Short mmCIF file of C-alpha atoms and ligand atoms in Angstrom, two decimals:
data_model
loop_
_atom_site.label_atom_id
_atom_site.label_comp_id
_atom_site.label_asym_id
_atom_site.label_seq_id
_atom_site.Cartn_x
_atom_site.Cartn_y
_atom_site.Cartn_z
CA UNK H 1 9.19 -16.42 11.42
CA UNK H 2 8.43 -13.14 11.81
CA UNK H 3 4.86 -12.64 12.89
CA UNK H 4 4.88 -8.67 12.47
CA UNK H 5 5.70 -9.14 8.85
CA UNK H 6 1.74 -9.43 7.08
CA UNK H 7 1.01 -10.41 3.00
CA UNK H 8 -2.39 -9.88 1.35
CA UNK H 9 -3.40 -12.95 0.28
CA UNK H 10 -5.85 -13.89 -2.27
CA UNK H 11 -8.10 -17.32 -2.47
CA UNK H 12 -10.68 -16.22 -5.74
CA UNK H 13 -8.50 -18.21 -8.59
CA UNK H 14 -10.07 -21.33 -9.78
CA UNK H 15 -9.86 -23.56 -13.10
CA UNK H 16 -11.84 -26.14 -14.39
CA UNK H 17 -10.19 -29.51 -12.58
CA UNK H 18 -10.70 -28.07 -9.34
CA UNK H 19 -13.96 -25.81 -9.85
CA UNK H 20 -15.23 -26.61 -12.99
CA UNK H 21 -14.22 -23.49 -14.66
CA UNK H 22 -11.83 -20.89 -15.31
CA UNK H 23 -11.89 -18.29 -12.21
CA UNK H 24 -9.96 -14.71 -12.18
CA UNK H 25 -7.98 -16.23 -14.68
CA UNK H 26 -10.05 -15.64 -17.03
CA UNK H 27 -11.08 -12.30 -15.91
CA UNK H 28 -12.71 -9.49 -18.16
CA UNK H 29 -11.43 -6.12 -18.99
CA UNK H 30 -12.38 -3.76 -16.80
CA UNK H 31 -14.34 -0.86 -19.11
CA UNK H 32 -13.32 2.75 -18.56
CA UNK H 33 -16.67 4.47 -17.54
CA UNK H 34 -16.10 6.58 -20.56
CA UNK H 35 -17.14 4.40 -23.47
CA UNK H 36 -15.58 6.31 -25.95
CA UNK H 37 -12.26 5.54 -24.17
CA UNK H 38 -13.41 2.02 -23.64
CA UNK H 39 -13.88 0.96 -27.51
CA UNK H 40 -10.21 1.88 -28.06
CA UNK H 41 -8.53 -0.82 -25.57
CA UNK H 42 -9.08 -4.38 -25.55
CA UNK H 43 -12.37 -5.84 -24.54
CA UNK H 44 -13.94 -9.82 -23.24
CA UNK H 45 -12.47 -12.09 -20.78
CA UNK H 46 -9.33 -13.57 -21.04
CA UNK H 47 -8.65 -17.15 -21.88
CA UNK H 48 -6.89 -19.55 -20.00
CA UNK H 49 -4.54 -21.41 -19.37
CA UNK H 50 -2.18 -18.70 -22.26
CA UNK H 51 -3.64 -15.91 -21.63
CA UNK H 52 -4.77 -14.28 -18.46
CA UNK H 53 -5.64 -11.54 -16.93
CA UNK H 54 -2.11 -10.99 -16.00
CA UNK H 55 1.39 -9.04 -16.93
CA UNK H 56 3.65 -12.07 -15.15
CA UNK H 57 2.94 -15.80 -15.29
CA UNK H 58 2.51 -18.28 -12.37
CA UNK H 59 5.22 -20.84 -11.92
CA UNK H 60 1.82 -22.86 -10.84
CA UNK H 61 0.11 -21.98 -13.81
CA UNK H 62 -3.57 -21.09 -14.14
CA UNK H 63 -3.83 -22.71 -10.23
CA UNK H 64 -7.09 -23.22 -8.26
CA UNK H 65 -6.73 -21.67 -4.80
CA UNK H 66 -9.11 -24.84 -3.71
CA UNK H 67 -6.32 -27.36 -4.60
CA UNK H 68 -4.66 -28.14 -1.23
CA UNK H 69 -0.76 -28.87 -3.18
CA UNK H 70 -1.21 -24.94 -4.06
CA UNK H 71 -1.98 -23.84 -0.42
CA UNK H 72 1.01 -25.73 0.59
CA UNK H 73 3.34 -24.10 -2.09
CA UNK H 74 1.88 -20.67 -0.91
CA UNK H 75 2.56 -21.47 3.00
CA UNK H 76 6.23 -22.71 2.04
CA UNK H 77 6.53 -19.63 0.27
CA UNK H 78 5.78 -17.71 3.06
CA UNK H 79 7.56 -19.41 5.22
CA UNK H 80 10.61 -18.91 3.04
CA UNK H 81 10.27 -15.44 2.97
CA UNK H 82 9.99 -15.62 6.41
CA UNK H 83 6.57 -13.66 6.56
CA UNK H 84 4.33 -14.87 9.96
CA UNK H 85 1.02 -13.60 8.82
CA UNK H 86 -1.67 -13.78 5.84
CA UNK H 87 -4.47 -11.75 5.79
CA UNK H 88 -7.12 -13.39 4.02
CA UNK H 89 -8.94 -11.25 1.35
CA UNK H 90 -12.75 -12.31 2.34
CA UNK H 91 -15.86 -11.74 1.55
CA UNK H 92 -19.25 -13.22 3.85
CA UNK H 93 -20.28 -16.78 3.19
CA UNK H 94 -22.13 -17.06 -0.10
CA UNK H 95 -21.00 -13.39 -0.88
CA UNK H 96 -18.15 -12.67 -3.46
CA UNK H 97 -16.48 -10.18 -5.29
CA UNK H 98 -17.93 -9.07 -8.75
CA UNK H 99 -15.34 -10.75 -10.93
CA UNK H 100 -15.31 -14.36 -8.92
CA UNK H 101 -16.97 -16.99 -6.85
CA UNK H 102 -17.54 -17.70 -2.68
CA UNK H 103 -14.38 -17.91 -0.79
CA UNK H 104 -15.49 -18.35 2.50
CA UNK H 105 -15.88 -21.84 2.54
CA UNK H 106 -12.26 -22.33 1.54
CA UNK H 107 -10.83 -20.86 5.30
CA UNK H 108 -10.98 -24.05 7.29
CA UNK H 109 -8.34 -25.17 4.53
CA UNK H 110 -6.22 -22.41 4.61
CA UNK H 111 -5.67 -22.07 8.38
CA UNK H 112 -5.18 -26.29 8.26
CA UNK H 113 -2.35 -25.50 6.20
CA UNK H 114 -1.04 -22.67 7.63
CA UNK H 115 -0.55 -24.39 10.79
CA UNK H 116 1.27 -27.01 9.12
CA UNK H 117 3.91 -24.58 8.79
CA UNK H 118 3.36 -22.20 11.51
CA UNK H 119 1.82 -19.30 10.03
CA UNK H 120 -1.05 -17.35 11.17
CA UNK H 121 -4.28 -16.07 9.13
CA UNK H 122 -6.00 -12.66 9.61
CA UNK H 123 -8.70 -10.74 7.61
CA UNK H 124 -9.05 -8.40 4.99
CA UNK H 125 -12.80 -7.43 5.24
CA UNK H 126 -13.71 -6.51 1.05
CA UNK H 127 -15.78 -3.98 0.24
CA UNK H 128 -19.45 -5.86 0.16
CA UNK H 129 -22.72 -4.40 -1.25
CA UNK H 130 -24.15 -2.71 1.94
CA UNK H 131 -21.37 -3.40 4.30
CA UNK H 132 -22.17 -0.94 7.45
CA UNK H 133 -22.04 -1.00 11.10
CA UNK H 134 -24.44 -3.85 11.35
CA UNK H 135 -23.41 -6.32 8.90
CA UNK H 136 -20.26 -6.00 10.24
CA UNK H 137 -21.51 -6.87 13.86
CA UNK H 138 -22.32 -9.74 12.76
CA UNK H 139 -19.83 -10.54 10.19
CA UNK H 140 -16.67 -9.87 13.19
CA UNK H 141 -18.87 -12.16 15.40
CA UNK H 142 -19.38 -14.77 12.44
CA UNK H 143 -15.02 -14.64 12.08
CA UNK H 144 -14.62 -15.13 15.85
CA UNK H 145 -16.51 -17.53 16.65
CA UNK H 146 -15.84 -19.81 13.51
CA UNK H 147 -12.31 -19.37 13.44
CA UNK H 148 -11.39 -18.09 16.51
CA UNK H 149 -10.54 -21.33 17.95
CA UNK H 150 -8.56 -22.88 15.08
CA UNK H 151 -4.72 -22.70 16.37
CA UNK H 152 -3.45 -20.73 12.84
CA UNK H 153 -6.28 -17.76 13.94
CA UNK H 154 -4.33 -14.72 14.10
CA UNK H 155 -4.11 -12.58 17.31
CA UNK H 156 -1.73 -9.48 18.02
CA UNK H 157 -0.31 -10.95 21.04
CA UNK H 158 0.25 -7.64 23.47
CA UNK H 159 3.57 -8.52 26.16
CA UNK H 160 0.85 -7.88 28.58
CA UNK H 161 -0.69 -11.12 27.42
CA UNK H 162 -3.91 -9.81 26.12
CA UNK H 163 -4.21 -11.66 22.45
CA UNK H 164 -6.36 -9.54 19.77
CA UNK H 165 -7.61 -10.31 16.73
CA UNK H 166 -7.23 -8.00 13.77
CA UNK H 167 -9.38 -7.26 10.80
CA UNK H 168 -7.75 -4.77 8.06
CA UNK H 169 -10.99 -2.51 6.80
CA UNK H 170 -10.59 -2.44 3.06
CA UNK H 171 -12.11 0.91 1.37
CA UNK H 172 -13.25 1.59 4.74
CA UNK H 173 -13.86 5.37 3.93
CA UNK H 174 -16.88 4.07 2.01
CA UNK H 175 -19.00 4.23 5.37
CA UNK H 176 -19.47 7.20 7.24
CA UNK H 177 -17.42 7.75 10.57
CA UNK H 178 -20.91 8.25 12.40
CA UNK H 179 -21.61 4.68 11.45
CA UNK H 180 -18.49 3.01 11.95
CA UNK H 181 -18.19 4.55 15.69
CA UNK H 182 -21.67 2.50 16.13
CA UNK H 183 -19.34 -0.85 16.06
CA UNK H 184 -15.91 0.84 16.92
CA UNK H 185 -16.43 3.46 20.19
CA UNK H 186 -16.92 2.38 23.67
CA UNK H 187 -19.87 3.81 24.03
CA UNK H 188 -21.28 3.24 20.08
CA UNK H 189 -25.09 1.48 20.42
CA UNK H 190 -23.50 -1.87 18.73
CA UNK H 191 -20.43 -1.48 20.02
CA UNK H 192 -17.67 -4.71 20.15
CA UNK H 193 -15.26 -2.45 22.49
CA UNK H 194 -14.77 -4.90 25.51
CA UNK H 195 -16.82 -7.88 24.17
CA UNK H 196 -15.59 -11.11 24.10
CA UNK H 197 -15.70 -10.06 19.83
CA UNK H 198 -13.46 -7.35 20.29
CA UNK H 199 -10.11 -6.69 18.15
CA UNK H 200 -7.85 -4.04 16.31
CA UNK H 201 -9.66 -2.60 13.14
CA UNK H 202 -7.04 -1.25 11.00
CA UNK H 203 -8.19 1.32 8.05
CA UNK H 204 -7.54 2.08 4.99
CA UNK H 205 -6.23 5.45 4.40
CA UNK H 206 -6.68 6.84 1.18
CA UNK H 207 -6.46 10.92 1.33
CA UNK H 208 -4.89 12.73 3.91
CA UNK H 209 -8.03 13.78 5.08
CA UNK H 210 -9.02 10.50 6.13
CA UNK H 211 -6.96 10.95 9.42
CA UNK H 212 -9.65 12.74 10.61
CA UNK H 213 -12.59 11.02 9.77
CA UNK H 214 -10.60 7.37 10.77
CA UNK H 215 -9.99 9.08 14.47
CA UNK H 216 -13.67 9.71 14.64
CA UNK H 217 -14.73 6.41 13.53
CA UNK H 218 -12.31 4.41 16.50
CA UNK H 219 -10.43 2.37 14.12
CA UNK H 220 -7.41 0.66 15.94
CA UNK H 221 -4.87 1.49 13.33
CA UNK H 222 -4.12 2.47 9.79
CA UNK H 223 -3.22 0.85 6.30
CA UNK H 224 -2.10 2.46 2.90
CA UNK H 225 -2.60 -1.10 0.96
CA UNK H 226 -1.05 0.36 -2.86
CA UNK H 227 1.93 -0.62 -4.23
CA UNK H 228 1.94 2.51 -6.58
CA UNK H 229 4.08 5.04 -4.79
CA UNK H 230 2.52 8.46 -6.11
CA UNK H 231 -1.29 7.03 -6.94
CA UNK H 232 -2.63 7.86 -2.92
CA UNK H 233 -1.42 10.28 -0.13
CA UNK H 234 -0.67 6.83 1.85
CA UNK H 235 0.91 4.71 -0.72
CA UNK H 236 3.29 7.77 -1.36
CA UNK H 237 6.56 6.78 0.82
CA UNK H 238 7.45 10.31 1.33
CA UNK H 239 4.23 10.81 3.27
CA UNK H 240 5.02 7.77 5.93
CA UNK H 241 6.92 9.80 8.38
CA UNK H 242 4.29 12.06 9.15
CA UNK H 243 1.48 8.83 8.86
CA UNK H 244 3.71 7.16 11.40
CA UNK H 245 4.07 10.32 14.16
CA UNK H 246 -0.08 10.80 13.21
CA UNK H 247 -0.25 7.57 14.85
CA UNK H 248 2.11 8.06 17.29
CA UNK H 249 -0.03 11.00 18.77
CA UNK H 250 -3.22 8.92 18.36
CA UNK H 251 -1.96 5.76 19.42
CA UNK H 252 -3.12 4.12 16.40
CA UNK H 253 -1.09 1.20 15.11
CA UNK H 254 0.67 2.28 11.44
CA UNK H 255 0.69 -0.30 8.92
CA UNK H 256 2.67 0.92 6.18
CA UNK H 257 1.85 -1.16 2.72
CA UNK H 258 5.06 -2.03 0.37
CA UNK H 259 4.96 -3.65 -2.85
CA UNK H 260 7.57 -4.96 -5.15
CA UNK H 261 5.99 -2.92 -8.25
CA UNK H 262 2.83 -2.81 -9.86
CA UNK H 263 1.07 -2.96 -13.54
CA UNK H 264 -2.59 -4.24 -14.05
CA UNK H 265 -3.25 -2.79 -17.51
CA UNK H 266 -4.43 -6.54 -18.55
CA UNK H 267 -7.31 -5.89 -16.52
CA UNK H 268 -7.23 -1.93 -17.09
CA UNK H 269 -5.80 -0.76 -19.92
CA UNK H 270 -6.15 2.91 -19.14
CA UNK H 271 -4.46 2.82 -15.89
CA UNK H 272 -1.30 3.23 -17.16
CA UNK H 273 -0.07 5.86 -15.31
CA UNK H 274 0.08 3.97 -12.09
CA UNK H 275 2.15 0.74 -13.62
CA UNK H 276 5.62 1.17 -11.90
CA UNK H 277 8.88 -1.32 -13.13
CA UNK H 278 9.81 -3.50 -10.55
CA UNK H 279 13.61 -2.53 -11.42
CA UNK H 280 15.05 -5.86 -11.16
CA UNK H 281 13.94 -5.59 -7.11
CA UNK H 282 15.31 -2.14 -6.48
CA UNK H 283 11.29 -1.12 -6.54
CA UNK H 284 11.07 -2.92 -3.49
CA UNK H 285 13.57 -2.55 -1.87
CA UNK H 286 13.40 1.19 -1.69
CA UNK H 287 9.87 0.43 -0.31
CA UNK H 288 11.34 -1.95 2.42
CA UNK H 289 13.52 0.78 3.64
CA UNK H 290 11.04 3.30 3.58
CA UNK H 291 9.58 1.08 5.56
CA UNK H 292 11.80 0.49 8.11
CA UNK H 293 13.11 3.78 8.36
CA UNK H 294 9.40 4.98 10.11
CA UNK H 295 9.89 1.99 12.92
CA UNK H 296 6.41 0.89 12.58
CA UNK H 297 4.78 -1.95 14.76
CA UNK H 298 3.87 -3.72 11.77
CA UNK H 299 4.45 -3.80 8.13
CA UNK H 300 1.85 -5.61 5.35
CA UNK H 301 2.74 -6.65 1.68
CA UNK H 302 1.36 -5.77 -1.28
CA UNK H 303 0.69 -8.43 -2.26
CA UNK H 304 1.62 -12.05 -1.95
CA UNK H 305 -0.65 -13.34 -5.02
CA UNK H 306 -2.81 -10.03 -6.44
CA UNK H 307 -1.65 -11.43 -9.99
CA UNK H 308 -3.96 -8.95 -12.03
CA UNK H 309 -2.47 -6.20 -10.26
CA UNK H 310 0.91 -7.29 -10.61
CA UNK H 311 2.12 -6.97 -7.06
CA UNK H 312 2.58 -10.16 -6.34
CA UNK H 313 5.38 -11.96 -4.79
CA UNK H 314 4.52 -15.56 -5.56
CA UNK H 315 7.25 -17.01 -7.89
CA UNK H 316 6.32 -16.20 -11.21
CA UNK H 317 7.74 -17.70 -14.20
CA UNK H 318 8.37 -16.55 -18.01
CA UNK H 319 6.15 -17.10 -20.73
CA UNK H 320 5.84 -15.87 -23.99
CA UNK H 321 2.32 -17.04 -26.65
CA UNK H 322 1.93 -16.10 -29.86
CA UNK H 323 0.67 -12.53 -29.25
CA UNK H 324 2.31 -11.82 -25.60
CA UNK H 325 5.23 -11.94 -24.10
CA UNK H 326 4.61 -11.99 -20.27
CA UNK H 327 6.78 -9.56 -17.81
CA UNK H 328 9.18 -11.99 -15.51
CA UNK H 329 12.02 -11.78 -12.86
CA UNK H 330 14.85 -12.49 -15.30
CA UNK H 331 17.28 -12.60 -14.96
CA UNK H 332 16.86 -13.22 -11.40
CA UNK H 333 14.92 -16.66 -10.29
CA UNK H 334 10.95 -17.18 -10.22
CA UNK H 335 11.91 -16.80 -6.11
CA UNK H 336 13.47 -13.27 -6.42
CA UNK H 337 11.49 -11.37 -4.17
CA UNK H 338 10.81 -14.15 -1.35
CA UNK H 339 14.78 -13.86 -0.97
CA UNK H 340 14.43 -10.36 -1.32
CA UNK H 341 11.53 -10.33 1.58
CA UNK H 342 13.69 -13.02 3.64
CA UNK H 343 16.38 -10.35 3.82
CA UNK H 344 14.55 -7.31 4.86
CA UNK H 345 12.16 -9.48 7.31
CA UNK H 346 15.38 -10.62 9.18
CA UNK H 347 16.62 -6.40 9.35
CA UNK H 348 13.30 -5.50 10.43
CA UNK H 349 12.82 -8.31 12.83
CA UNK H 350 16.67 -7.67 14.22
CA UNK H 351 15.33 -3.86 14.54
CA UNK H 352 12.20 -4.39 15.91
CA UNK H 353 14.04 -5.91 19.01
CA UNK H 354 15.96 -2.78 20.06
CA UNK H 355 12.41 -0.36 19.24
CA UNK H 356 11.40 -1.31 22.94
CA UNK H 357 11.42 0.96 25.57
CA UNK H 358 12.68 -1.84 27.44
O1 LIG K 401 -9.14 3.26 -10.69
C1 LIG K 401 -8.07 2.32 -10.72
C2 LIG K 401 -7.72 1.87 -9.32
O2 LIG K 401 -8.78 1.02 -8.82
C3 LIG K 401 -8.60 0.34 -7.56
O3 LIG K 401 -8.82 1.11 -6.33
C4 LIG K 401 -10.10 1.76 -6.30
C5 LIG K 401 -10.53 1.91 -4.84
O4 LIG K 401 -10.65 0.63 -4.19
C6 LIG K 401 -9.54 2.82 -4.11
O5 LIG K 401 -10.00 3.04 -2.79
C7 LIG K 401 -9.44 4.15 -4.83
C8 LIG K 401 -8.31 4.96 -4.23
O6 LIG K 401 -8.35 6.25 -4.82
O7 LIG K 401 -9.11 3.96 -6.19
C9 LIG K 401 -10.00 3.13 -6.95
O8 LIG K 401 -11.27 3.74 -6.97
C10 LIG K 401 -7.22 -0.32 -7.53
O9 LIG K 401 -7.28 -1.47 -8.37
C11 LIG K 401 -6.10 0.64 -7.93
O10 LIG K 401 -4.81 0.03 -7.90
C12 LIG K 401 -6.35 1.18 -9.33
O11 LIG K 401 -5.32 2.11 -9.68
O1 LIG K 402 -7.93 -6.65 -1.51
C1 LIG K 402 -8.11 -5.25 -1.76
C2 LIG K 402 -8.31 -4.92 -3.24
C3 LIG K 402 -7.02 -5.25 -3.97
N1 LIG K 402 -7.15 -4.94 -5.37
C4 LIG K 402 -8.21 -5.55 -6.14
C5 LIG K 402 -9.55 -5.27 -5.44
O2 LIG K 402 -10.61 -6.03 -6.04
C6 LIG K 402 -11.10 -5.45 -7.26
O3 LIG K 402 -10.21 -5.60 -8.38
C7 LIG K 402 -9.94 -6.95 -8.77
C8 LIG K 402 -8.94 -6.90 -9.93
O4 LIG K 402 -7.72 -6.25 -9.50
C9 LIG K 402 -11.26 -7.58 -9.17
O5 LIG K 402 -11.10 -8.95 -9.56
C10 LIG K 402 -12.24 -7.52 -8.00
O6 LIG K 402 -13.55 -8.00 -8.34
C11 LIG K 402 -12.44 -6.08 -7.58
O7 LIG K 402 -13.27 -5.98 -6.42
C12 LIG K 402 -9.49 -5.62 -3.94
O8 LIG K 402 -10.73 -5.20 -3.36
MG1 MG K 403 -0.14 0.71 23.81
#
């Protein structure tokens, strides 16, 4: 298992058996904020269990994230590909993002299962109303001390023996440096440097100008997240070799972000421009070597189950309604790109071995 292999995981998809309606699944189309552009493309929320708001199709169907046979399927999976690490898309208890329900309350079930089959969970802090310095406090405190203890609770284990936990800062630009080196600097006026709460905040890095403003801020490391090569200055592969000696210089921790493709015009229509054919796997595997090629500390996944966006990894299955013929993996297997991560995992963990400087 290799635990410095990490996939974006999602818990926000529900259906009516399990939480008494349709959840994500039947998500709405996202409106261009021109409306004249918006009247052109289709409009509502999708409707389960034929149509959602994906491209590809779930070998578990329209699956609630709450039904413990899914989180098993999802850990195997994982397992399989040989991928150590989850991070956890979350929002605070009773807090959720704009197109779902609470997710929170679901983590004491996903880190039961992941320690089933020995795989850690970390966190991917979402972009809440009013997330700042001090919410965060006290959100980082909330995650430590609730999960902290559970035996699935991620830490980057140093060889020094020191055992952190992480938290990957999603749209993290969105609050001022100023702020952020409240929480993040030793000597910030709420700072978590050298508490018992402390950890390794990676950033997201959008623009290359965020370098800057991330350095000033005293984030731990940074994050590109997009599977689009070309939308961002750090999901652009070409751009990693100079991300990773950034980092280098800094002593940050680079995260680069690979994805086996990506298409979410179900959900935006307009946003054509960034959908990118997954090639039959040669998408992603170009990103895996681009990857490698930077010999970073750690590498994330876009994404193990971001199904609207279609990034995902999850087996996914063909499907063709009335009106739609899903996109698939033919004519490889629903598993394609779990083999395909198994394979590059194993390189990059064989690799990893021989970075040390001892
Ligand atoms: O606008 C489409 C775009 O939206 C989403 O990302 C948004 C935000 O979270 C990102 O930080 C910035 C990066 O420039 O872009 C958007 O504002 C994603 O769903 C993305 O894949 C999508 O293309
Ligand atoms: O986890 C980081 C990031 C990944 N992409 C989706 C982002 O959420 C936003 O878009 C989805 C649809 O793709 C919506 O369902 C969410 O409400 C919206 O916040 C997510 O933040
Ligand atoms: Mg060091």
């Amino acid at each position: 298992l290799n635990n410095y292999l990490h996939v974006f995981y999602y818990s926000w998809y529900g259906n009516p058996q399990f939480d008494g309606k349709y959840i994500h699944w039947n998500h709405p189309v996202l409106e261009h904020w021109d409306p004249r552009i918006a009247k052109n493309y289709p409009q509502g929320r999708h409707n389960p269990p034929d149509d959602i708001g994906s491209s590809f199709y779930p070998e578990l169907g329209s699956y609630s994230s709450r039904d413990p046979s899914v989180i098993e399927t999802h850990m195997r999976q994982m397992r399989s590909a040989s991928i150590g690490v989850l991070a956890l898309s979350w929002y605070p208890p009773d807090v959720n993002d704009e197109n779902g329900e609470p997710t929170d309350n679901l983590v004491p079930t996903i880190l039961d299962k992941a320690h089933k089959y020995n795989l850690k969970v970390t966190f991917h802090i979402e972009p809440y109303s009013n997330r700042d310095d001090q919410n965060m406090y006290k959100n980082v405190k909330y995650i430590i001390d609730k999960y902290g203890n559970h035996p699935a609770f991620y830490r980057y284990k140093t060889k020094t023996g020191n055992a952190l936990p992480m938290f990957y800062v999603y749209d993290s630009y969105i609050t001022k440096p100023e702020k952020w080196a409240n929480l993040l600097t030793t000597s910030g006026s709420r700072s978590i440097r050298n508490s018992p709460y402390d950890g390794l905040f990676i950033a997201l890095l959008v623009e290359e100008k965020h370098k800057y403003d991330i350095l000033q801020s005293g984030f731990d490391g940074i994050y590109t997240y997009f599977a689009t090569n070309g939308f961002t200055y750090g999901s652009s592969h070409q751009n990693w070799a100079s991300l990773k000696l950034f980092c280098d210089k800094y002593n940050l921790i680079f995260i680069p972000s690979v994805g086996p493709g990506y298409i979410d015009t179900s959900i935006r229509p307009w946003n054509t421009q960034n959908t990118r054919n997954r090639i039959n796997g040669k998408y992603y595997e170009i990103g895996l070597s681009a990857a490698l090629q930077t010999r970073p500390s750690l590498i994330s996944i876009t994404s193990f189950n971001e199904w609207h966006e279609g990034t995902q990894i999850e087996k996914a299955v063909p499907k063709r309604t009335s009106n739609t013929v899903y996109l698939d993996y033919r004519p490889h297997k629903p598993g394609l790109y779990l083999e395909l991560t198994r394979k590059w995992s194993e390189k990059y963990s064989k690799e990893r071995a021989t970075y040390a400087l001892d």
